[PDB]
């Protein structure tokens, strides 16, 4: 229904740990851990990277967590590095059978 | 979620973890014969802290009364107050009381009145092992387990509970539909029926079939539509008892009633309010129905078989 | 996850209709649903719809209004229909697996998106 | 559903959640013997209103026929009157009469002409405890629970229905291929075939 | 075909038998192929989209022996025809005799 | 058969909490032990003396610290239940019945 609201621009120095913390409604992150995220690298296919909140499927860095709070999910970064180098987008599934997404956000090695 | 082995998905934790859940009850058969109503006991909060602090637990008689639910494998307590979330048990039974039937106190009574014959017959496997939902009541002692790290950093609930299951109802092990002769009781009073009454309690889960049942709100659709079928749920309970009646005299000589007197003062006064009139019981009515010729009855074709 | 295919009119005009198809490839629907999400410059990502095996639709409540879908199962693929296409239209739009199920009977698992699709520029 | 347990299912259709089900039915014997055909008890549509209203229920006696089915485990009664939806049981009962002996009404007649000799042996057990889909005639009491929120706000269904299952057929716990011998009714008719007839009523399940 | 072996009129062919079953279906299935006899339109109401078409509805289970027993055994005893149930009292006439035995908890 | 029961910190709610609810297991257990005796006598002979010194030396003391004060046994006492009319007692009349 509405577009998730984010911290559009994030950074840090290499090995820092960064949270990407991202803000909703009850009806979308609140009541429902429907919470995904994506990792786009530059005119790529959206890569999966949490799902269900805190699920990681195969293949992605095992430095990648997720979490949850209030209305606010989260998708925590350790040891920040090259590979992390990429846009950030959440979703939600909303209980009225509808998708959601943020605005995006960046990362940046200082 | 359960915890009989791992499964593919578990619960993500949350503020309402609940699921629409049913289970198959114990299995029972019973039929207590007296002239007083019959004594059950179950679990009830006991003699009067902080909020959400475990109830005083007591063991409570009390006569048994026609609609009463009968212990179903999840114990008999008085759920209504002993649970207070008003989801721990399935929805029969999540606001009343599981009684059961306290032969101990019945059969150990002074004079018997209570129990002439009784009969029973129970089973149950368990079918699933769950788990519990809510915040801990008592911590597991750190001294029964090493500490884990990460993911098992938190325990997971330890409030397991079974759900009962009663296997097979098989026309073998039936109990009624067989006259039962009452020619010995165990206790003192040997079949005498005191103040002109009985009570025949009687549980039998082995006919608990419930019946679906559709209804249309139209019949102008000719594709099928959730929308249009109402559902319901009927039970149907069909009983039919048959007595043999013999009858006794009793000579009253000064000794024969003080005795009488010191056992139940009532019988002299009717000799010449109702007590029990605070309990609810299927009244049966037999004044109208006594005949003397009873080889014309089933049972009384079978009691002079056998005398 | 299944492996994905983009191709539709790329090049468009103002007031033209957009027609969009996706094949399936390595796999089958299966009682997944397949969504389309669109990323236009200076946006985010913006959902469209969904539509699975046997003909159920949902759309977004705003863009409903000019979507449309449909799905054949005989050569793998479904299609996207969108009228009255505008500048803002132009977006990079994607493919989509939606692994959604049902658990319990009271809530879902599995309501991420997969199997992203490179993804195909289309412009107004 | 498959209320049993927390399962794995497609995204709902919403409508028409229908699924290609099949079970094993309760186990059944019965050999009834006299000079007048049996009686059989079933519920039926009984005396009388918006439309969808549960229907009331009434225990009708009717003699028995060649060809009448028998009690499945999904209780004995009118299924074409009282299931307007046609899909609630399997597909033999579904527009039939399910109908059990009525053994009291049978022994309780004055001459005993209906029934001198029976044998009966039934068992069964739930196999799976399923869930209907429908709208709900008769709402849950607001005292059973408290009202959730989110993905529990609105109650699943609660009409519960078993499947049955006969469990093993034994050659030990057979009635048939042997000889049972009518030297004493229960009853005052003594075996006489009045109007040179009889009328063996047999039920067997076991070989199905 | 015990029946017709019984009734014989002389009861040469079954001086004594004995005979022990059981089972119970494990699992139940579907058929594949294409429906013979189309189910009747008045047993059921017509649905729509994904249920526009039936399904199979030839279904059939598998068996299943169940638990064999050391005290159900039939064989390792000795049995006596002290009086055959038909009119042949064990006369092998002929010369011949006919064992036919069937063992399912060996296999 | 553990009971599981729990006590609601507060009532004022209307909504379902898993906080808001604390659970607990609990057991009990219900015995009721009869007994019927006998009593007996024994000829203090100088054979039988040697021989129940020989099987247990307490006896003969006894019959002028505990032993076993090292164990943790639900203790029973019945000095002053003992009752000579058996039909009285369930037990007492299958006792009388058996004989």
């Known amino acids: 229904q509405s577009a998730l609201t984010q911290p559009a621009s994030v950074s840090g120095s290499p090995g820092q740990s960064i949270t990407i913390s991202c803000t909703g409604t009850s009806n979308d992150v609140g009541d429902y851990d429907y919470v995904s995220w994506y990792q786009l690298h530059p005119g790529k296919a959206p890569k999966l990277l949490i799902f269900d909140v805190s699920r990681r499927p195969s293949g992605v860095s095992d430095r990648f967590s997720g979490s949850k709070s209030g209305d606010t999910a989260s998708l925590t970064i350790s040891g920040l590095q090259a590979e992390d180098e990429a846009d950030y987008y959440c979703s939600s599934y909303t209980g009225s059978s509808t998708y959601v997404f943020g605005t995006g956000t960046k990362v940046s090695v200082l | 979620d359960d915890t009989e082995n791992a499964s593919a998905y578990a619960a993500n934790a949350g503020v309402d973890n609940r699921e629409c859940i049913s289970m198959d009850y114990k299995q029972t058969q019973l039929c207590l014969i007296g002239c007083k109503p019959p004594i059950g006991e179950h679990w009830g909060k006991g003699s009067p802290v902080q909020p959400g602090d475990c109830p005083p637990l007591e063991l409570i008689n009390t006569v048994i009364q026609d609609g009463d639910m009968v212990d179903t494998g999840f114990g008999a307590m008085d759920f209504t107050t002993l649970q207070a979330n008003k989801s721990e048990v399935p929805l029969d039974i999540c606001t009343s009381i599981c009684k059961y039937p306290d032969y101990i106190k019945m059969v150990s009574e002074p004079y018997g009145d209570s129990l002439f014959f009784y009969l029973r017959r129970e089973q149950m496997f368990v079918r699933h092992l769950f788990n519990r939902a809510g915040t801990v009541g008592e911590n597991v002692p750190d001294d029964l387990y090493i500490k884990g790290s990460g993911s098992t950093a938190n325990l997971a609930s330890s409030n397991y509970f079974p759900t009962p299951s009663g296997s097979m109802v098989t026309s073998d092990a039936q109990i009624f539909n067989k006259p039962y002769w009452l020619q010995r009781a165990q206790g003192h009073n040997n079949g005498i029926c005191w103040g002109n009454q009985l009570f025949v309690t009687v549980v039998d889960t082995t006919r608990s079939t419930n019946m679906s049942l559709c209804a249309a709100i139209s019949t102008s659709e000719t594709t099928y539509k959730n929308t249009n079928f109402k559902e319901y749920l009927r039970h149907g309970e069909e009983y039919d008892l048959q007595f043999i009646f013999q009858l006794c005299k009793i000579t009253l000589t000064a000794d024969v009633m003080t005795y009488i007197h010191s056992m139940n003062s009532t019988i002299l006064e009717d000799w010449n309010e109702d007590p029990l009139k605070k309990y609810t019981f299927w009244e049966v009515n037999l004044k109208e129905k006594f005949s003397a010729d009873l080889d014309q009855f089933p049972l009384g074709r079978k009691f002079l078989l056998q005398l | 996850q299944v492996q994905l295919q983009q191709w539709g009119a790329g090049l468009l005009k103002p007031s033209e209709t957009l027609s969009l198809t996706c094949a399936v490839n390595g796999g089958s629907f299966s009682i997944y649903y397949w969504s389309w999400i669109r990323q236009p410059p200076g946006k985010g990502l913006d959902w469209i719809g969904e539509i699975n095996q046997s003909g159920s639709t949902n759309y977004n409540p705003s863009l409903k209004s000019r979507v449309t879908m449909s799905v054949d199962t005989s050569k793998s693929q479904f299609s996207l229909r969108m009228t009255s296409v505008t500048a803002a239209d132009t977006a990079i739009y994607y493919c989509?697996?939606?692994?959604?199920?049902?658990?319990?009977?009271?809530?879902?698992?599995?309501?991420?998106?997969?199997?992203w699709g490179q993804g195909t520029l289309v412009t107004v | 559903d498959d209320t049993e347990n927390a399962s794995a299912y497609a995204a709902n259709a919403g409508v028409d959640n229908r699924e290609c089900i099949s079970m094993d039915y309760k186990q059944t014997q019965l050999c009834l013997i006299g000079c007048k055909p049996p009686i059989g008890e079933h519920w039926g549509k009984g005396s009388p209103v918006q439309p969808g209203d549960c229907p009331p229920l009434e225990l009708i006696n009717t003699v028995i026929q060649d060809g009448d089915m028998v009690d499945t485990g999904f209780g004995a009664m009118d299924f074409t009157t009282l299931q307007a939806n046609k899909s609630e049981v399997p597909l033999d009962i579904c527009t039939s009469i399910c109908k059990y002996p009525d053994y009291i009404k049978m022994v309780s007649e004055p001459y005993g002409d209906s029934l001198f000799f029976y044998l009966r042996r039934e068992q069964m057990f739930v196999r799976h405890l399923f869930n209907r889909a429908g709208t709900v005639g008769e709402n849950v009491p607001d005292d059973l629970y408290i009202k959730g929120s989110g993905s529990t706000a609105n109650l699943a269904s609660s009409n519960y229905f078993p499947t049955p299952s006969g469990s093993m057929v034994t050659s030990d716990a057979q009635i048939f291929n042997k000889p049972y011998w009518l030297q004493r009714a229960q009853g005052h008719n003594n075996g006489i075939c009045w109007g040179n007839q009889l009328f063996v009523t047999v039920v067997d399940t076991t070989r199905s | 075909d015990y029946i017709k072996m019984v009734s014989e009129p002389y009861g040469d062919s079954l001086f004594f038998y004995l005979r022990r079953e059981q089972m119970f279906v494990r699992h139940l299935f579907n058929r594949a192929g294409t429906v013979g006899e189309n189910v009747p339109d008045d047993l059921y109401i017509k649905g729509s989209g994904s249920t526009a078409n039936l399904a199979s509805s030839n279904y059939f289970p598998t068996p299943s022996g169940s638990m064999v027993t050391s005290d159900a055994q039939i064989f390792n005893k000795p049995y006596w025809l002290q009086r055959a149930q038909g009119h042949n009292n064990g006369i092998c006439w002929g010369n011949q005799l006919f064992v036919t035995v069937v063992d399912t908890t060996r296999s | 058969t553990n009971m599981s029961l729990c006590a609601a910190i507060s009532t004022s709610e209307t909504t379902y909490k898993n906080t808001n609810f604390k659970e607990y297991l609990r057991h009990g257990e219900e015995y009721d032990l009869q007994f019927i005796f006998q009593l007996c006598k024994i000829t203090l002979t100088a054979d039988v003396m040697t021989y129940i010194h020989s099987m247990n030396s307490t006896i003969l003391e006894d019959w002028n610290e505990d032993p076993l004060k090292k164990y943790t046994f639900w203790e029973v006492n019945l000095k002053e239940k003992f009752s000579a009319d058996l039909d009285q007692f369930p037990l007492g009349r299958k006792f009388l019945l058996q004989l």
């Open positions: 989509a697996r939606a692994p959604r199920i049902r658990w319990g009977s009271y809530r879902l698992k599995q309501t991420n998106f997969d199997s």
